[PDB]
Amino acid sequence: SASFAPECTDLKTKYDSCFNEWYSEKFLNECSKQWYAYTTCVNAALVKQGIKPALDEAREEAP
């Protein structure tokens, strides 16, 4: 399973494996460290893709 941002894909796998264990055994929030890593990467990627084009377009001036 990939991610919309490739740099996050490995942290995504590291969260997914832990959550699979947590779900299969315990639940049927102990994976909070990999969750923090993954959500930080995904938040940064969302910021980049969705916001920055507008800023780089609005940065067009005599520097």
Next chain:
Amino acid sequence: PMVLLHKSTHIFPTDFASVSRAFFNRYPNPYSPHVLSIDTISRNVDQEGNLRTTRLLKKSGKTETWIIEVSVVNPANSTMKTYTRNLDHTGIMKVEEYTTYQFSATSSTIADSRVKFSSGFNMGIKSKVEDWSRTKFDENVKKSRMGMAFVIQK
């Protein structure tokens, strides 16, 4: 706008835990080559003890589309509800899918799915046809009145 609903039922011969974990680990598989990425936006244990999850998929086709997937897992009732819908191209068509998984008499997990396809272009076509009919009506009325004046002239 235009709405259509279809329903189907499929029974997985497995436990609710296995089917639910499989739903959460569906890709990649040879039967779904169009999915390009999945991401977990939110996941928590609600006040009622149910797991609420919101994931974000991206898919290709004939060209790429974002999809939101909302899911609730009640472990006490061994039930699961899933809902999916595209986030972009919503003005063209909106495809929503709602599925309920339940679990012992047949010892199987029943999944009742219902998909609602709503296209919004039904009004976008009507608006252009409306402008077209207004133009044609003006032209034809002018031509007919001018012909009537011409024949009064004789």
